[PDB]
Write a protein that binds this ligand. Sequence first.
Ligand code: H8S
Length: 356
Amino acid sequence: LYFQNAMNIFEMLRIDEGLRLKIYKDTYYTIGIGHLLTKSLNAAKSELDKAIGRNTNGVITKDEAEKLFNQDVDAAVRGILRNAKLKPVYDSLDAVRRAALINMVFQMGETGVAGFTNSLRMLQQKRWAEAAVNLAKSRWYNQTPNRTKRVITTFATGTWDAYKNLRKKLEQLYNRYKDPQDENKIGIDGIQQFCDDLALDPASISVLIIAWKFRAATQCEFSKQEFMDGMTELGCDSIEKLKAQIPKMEQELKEPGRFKDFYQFTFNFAKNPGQKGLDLEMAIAYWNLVLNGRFKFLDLWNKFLLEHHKRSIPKDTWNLLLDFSTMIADDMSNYDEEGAWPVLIDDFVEFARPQI
Ligand SMILES: *CC(C)C(=O)NC[C@@H](NC(=O)[C@H](Cc1nc2ccc(C(C)C)cc2s1)NC(=O)CC)C1CCCCC1
């Protein structure tokens, strides 16, 4: 297999599809760059363990993800070559343009790509300009505008310039924020600078919404990989582009499913690494940001905790408070004292009820 390319192709799809180092769902058990494991998590982890050759517990290194990716590329190429509608075009193409074709197969499958009869013919004919214009007129171009533009540029030029130039733009932007003491991260000063450039306070709800969209691990920490992967997945190559994405993020949060996801993410982001629970003062500070205008009893809840709890908040309790806020009547008359709520919430209702 060492004789068969594959270096630029891994980085090309890492940018376009994304690299996940933990087992996820594609809406099917997946890992790496879209690597399907099975059609049970026990069975999914078993397949991953057998493929890697160690007890991974569903977590892998980038090198392991690369090994899996190379197998998927090899399978993709075998499939393209068996396809009578794809083989002629693939055969005629140079190495860089073959990588752009494999990119399409990875996104929409063989049948999806075979549907582009007119564009594929133009490619076979080496009519780059005509093909590039024709591909930009499809739903593919509208569904994934950033990825599609990059793939079309690969077909138009036969170079890696769309990927090379995005990485340049992102590395130059990163340099403005990186820690002088540690090049591989954005420190305290950098995070403040990033928020200043966005014209936002770092403790604001807008910045918390941004952290959620970036899947950031921890408050006051921001790694280079979080910055790079975040900006690419969001289709942003500048602060101005990210700024213009904020209204869309706000709208998403009006849907309860997305709000629940953001609410639960807040707990994980706010907590200290090495600790399983969230310190009370910190939990109250983030609750004031995320439950502002959603919970009638928020202030009385804060007073109750500061006076009667005075300890850490577990994840389950954090998660259940959103359900409590949604269902609770203004007079608390519908509260079920024997209806599975955490003891802390039972204690709060008992404390709050005399105060109305
Ligand atoms: C760490 C520190 C000195 C501190 O004051 N912590 C408590 C307050 N937290 C914040 O101010 C954080 C700062 C940020 N962290 C990150 C991490 C990644 C990003 C990228 C761009 C996605 C951005 C930021 S800003 N801010 C937040 O958590 C957003 C609300 C704490 C904030 C809440 C009120 C009490 C003080």
